[PDB]
Design a protein around this ligand. Structure first.
Ligand SMILES: [Mg+2]
Ligand SMILES: [Mg+2]
Ligand SMILES: [Mg+2]
Ligand SMILES: [Mg+2]
Ligand SMILES: [Mg+2]
Ligand SMILES: [Mg+2]
Ligand SMILES: [Mg+2]
Ligand SMILES: [Mg+2]
Ligand SMILES: [Mg+2]
Ligand SMILES: [Mg+2]
Ligand SMILES: [Mg+2]
Ligand SMILES: [Mg+2]
Ligand SMILES: [Mg+2]
Ligand SMILES: [Mg+2]
Ligand SMILES: [Mg+2]
Ligand SMILES: [Mg+2]
Ligand SMILES: [Mg+2]
Ligand SMILES: [Mg+2]
Ligand SMILES: [Mg+2]
Ligand SMILES: [Mg+2]
Ligand SMILES: [Mg+2]
Ligand SMILES: [Mg+2]
Ligand SMILES: [Mg+2]
Ligand SMILES: [Mg+2]
Ligand SMILES: [Mg+2]
Ligand SMILES: [Mg+2]
Ligand SMILES: [Mg+2]
Ligand SMILES: [Mg+2]
Ligand SMILES: [Mg+2]
Ligand SMILES: [Mg+2]
Ligand SMILES: [Mg+2]
Ligand SMILES: [Mg+2]
Ligand SMILES: [Mg+2]
Ligand SMILES: [Mg+2]
Ligand SMILES: [Mg+2]
Ligand SMILES: [Mg+2]
Ligand SMILES: [Mg+2]
Ligand SMILES: [Mg+2]
Ligand SMILES: [Mg+2]
Ligand SMILES: [Mg+2]
Ligand SMILES: [Mg+2]
Ligand SMILES: [Mg+2]
Ligand SMILES: [Mg+2]
Lengths: 110, 94, 119, 56, 66, 46
RNA sequence: AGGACCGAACCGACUAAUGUUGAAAAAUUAGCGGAUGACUUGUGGCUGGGGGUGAAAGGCCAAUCAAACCGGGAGAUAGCU
RNA sequence: CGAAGGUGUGCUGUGAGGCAUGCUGGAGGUAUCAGAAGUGCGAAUGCUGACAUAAGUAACGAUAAAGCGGGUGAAAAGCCCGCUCGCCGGAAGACCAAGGGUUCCUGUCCAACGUUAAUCGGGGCAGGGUGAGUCGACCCCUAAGGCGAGGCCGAAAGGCG
């Protein structure tokens, strides 16, 4: 039984988060949580709060045992890009992109 | 003689405030929200007639209305007028 | 190149480094344990431990030297009245660096630097 | 000082081939409190190599 | 503070507050305000500004063209 | 640098205001064009 | 006394470096000239486009000038791309 | 008992194309033979919107400078309190006019804004706050100048006074 947790509209780049998400693919959740505990990136805080939510959903809604859980699927999608204007010299305007993400963590007993 | 109908349309409301409670307990001065076109003589006559109480002096000021945003649509509140009415000593009011 | 040299620049000029290590040495004498970055703690050992070796011999001249280094008579009093006889037998190594992880604002590697005879 | 052709997603992936993070190999375990920490770092409760070096 | 009180009861000191006015989609609405405002601007900006490009002209293109 | 807009409400209203437009014939044609177009702020005048 | 001298405020802009997707659609730094006079500045006013003004460089007239800007004739015309 | 549309597959025609059907979709579509066209796009330094690239690169706005303890808090390099350090000091202090127009103060919030975080804020939300016979304006007076009863002049508008 697979259990999903998502942090949609994650205020972070998908490229910056996929570096962290590639560390914990296929791992046991106690190892993935210790890796995310001692990884110093902000995306580790995001994907840790999502993995903790997926664990609690698997425990409450699905009766899954925590020691057998395993991160079977994890993937980061591109979210909506809010766009801001940063002024440059000589009156020229540049349109910066303020990327978002959709973090998805699938955890299961398999 | 200022007419009683105008004297009934001059005063709008009492103004509740920390400053109004301080001036009421210390200087014996009430703070009123009045009509915008009301003058000081109309206020002194209204308080001296409708409350039957002795007014020493009236100080006035105009309060500019704030600019608010309901949702995303801009809007502006009304300008209103504020009166500090100093009662004579011994006078009392609810 | 940096052959056989010593002392960290710490992205500061010389007067800023001298006033920063003067403040940090006074704060370490005052509280006996502080949390700063690990490079500042390592360069602070080269400031504080000479003050204690100076403080082992309570003279008026050494009080004036420790005042010229620290500019705090409360620090000079704690140095010569307490930490002198406290460290009177240790052959150096009066302090201890304890790495305590990473600062949340800039991922700076922090460390607790404390005196040895604290607890 | 600027490109003349659009570089492909293949070259982008090959440039990002080395930008991968190295996970921490193994967390050291305190001998007294039994909790995990970084090797040569103090624990979260303030233990390091057994003794309580700082209260909290 | 009070979302939007459809109205605020002074009889007690509470408020009936329905409107999502001030909600995060309202916040996206102000995001939109500034969004297309700035965009119109950006356009008009690079319009009225990027004029005085020398483009090598004032000292090198000049000498070339001779 | 000193830019070209140094504001002054008195000079703004004497030059572009309502009574300055209503004074002359062509200024009255300005207010007739803005009413036909349906301007919210018909002039400068506050 | 002085369209006198040296020199800050103030006004200006001779030289160099930086910068040139700038901190800045002309500036900063180090020096520089005048500095009781044909000085400078605030506020308000007047002069209108083949017109103004100009110690005169075709300079300036809202970051636009060998004839401003806006609207209209107007879908000018283009044996040219 | 599943239309158009979307997405596949199979078949078919010399071609533009055509037919059947699976999934999605959930209400319209239309044979034939005629008729009328805003009737077919890859290019026009084409127009509008969206998304790439360079690239997680440059940069994060004066080289006046920060250090520590405690507090709050989900979390503190940036907030508060404190002790030190440094900077301006004919200003980088204080008071105004012009101009702006509530940015003032208090409580609360951190999505957006702030070139980082933010518990903070000139940010959001709510409330409060500007008190005059003497200050200033208004007002009496006129300058440059403007308007201008009549008037003079001018195709008209209007110009001058
Ligand atoms: Mg500019
Ligand atoms: Mg008043
Ligand atoms: Mg060495
Ligand atoms: Mg640095
Ligand atoms: Mg020095
Ligand atoms: Mg080419
Ligand atoms: Mg790389
Ligand atoms: Mg002279
Ligand atoms: Mg200079
Ligand atoms: Mg001189
Ligand atoms: Mg010539
Ligand atoms: Mg010009
Ligand atoms: Mg012309
Ligand atoms: Mg011409
Ligand atoms: Mg024609
Ligand atoms: Mg044409
Ligand atoms: Mg179907
Ligand atoms: Mg179809
Ligand atoms: Mg279908
Ligand atoms: Mg149809
Ligand atoms: Mg066509
Ligand atoms: Mg073609
Ligand atoms: Mg094209
Ligand atoms: Mg990139
Ligand atoms: Mg490169
Ligand atoms: Mg580089
Ligand atoms: Mg860099
Ligand atoms: Mg800065
Ligand atoms: Mg601190
Ligand atoms: Mg700082
Ligand atoms: Mg402080
Ligand atoms: Mg100084
Ligand atoms: Mg000075
Ligand atoms: Mg506001
Ligand atoms: Mg404030
Ligand atoms: Mg936050
Ligand atoms: Mg932020
Ligand atoms: Mg605010
Ligand atoms: Mg007067
Ligand atoms: Mg008069
Ligand atoms: Mg006159
Ligand atoms: Mg007449
Ligand atoms: Mg006249």
């Amino acid at each position: 039984m697979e259990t999903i947790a998502k942090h949609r509209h994650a205020r972070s780049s998908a490229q910056k988060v996929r570096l962290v998400a590639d560390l914990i693919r296929g791992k046991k959740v106690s190892q993935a949580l210790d890796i995310l505990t001692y990884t110093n990136k902000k995306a580790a805080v995001l994907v840790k709060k999502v993995l903790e939510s997926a664990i609690a959903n698997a425990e409450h809604n699905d009766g899954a045992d925590i020691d057998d859980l395993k991160v079977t699927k994890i993937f980061v999608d591109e979210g909506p890009s809010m766009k801001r204007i940063m002024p440059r010299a000589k009156g020229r305007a540049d349109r910066i992109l303020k990327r978002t993400s959709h973090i998805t963590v699938v955890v299961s007993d398999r | 003689m200022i007419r009683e109908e105008r004297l009934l349309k001059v005063l709008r409301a009492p103004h509740v405030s920390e400053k109004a409670s301080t001036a009421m307990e210390k200087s014996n001065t009430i703070v009123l929200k009045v009509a915008k076109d009301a003058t000081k003589a109309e206020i002194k006559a209204a308080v001296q007639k409708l409350f039957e109480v002795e007014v020493e002096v009236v100080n006035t000021l105009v309060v500019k209305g704030k600019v608010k945003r309901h949702g995303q649509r801009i809007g502006r509140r009304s300008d209103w007028k504020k009166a500090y009415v100093t009662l004579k000593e011994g006078q009392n009011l609810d | 190149m940096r052959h056989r040299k010593s002392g960290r620049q710490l992205n500061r000029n010389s007067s800023h480094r001298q006033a920063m290590f003067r403040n940090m040495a006074g704060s370490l004498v005052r509280h006996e344990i502080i949390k700063t970055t690990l490079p500042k703690a390592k360069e602070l050992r080269r400031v504080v431990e000479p003050l204690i070796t100076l403080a082992k011999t309570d003279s008026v001249a050494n009080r004036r030297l420790a005042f010229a280094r620290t500019r705090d008579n409360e620090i000079v009093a704690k140095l010569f009245n307490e930490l002198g006889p406290r460290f009177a037998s240790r052959a150096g190594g009066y302090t201890r660096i304890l790495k305590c992880g990473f600062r949340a604002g800039d991922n700076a590697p922090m460390a607790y630097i404390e005196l040895v005879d604290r607890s | 000082a600027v490109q003349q052709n659009k570089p492909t997603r293949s070259k982008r992936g090959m440039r990002r081939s080395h930008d991968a993070l190295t996970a921490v190999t193994s967390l050291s375990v305190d001998k007294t409190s039994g909790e995990k920490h970084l090797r040569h770092h103090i624990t979260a409760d303030g233990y390091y190599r057994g003794r309580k070096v700082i209260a909290k | 503070m009070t979302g939007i009180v459809k109205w605020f009861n002074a009889d007690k000191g509470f408020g009936f507050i329905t409107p999502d006015d001030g909600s995060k989609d309202v916040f996206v609405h102000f995001s939109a305000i500034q969004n297309d405002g700035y965009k119109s601007k950006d356009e008009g900006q690079k319009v009225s500004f990027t004029i005085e490009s020398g483009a090598k002209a004032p000292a090198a293109g000049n000498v070339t063209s001779l | 640098m000193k830019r070209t807009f140094q504001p002054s409400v008195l000079k703004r209203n004497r030059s572009h205001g309502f009574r300055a437009r209503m004074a002359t014939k062509n200024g009255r044609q300005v207010l007739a064009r803005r009413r036909a177009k349906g301007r919210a702020r018909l002039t400068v005048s506050k």
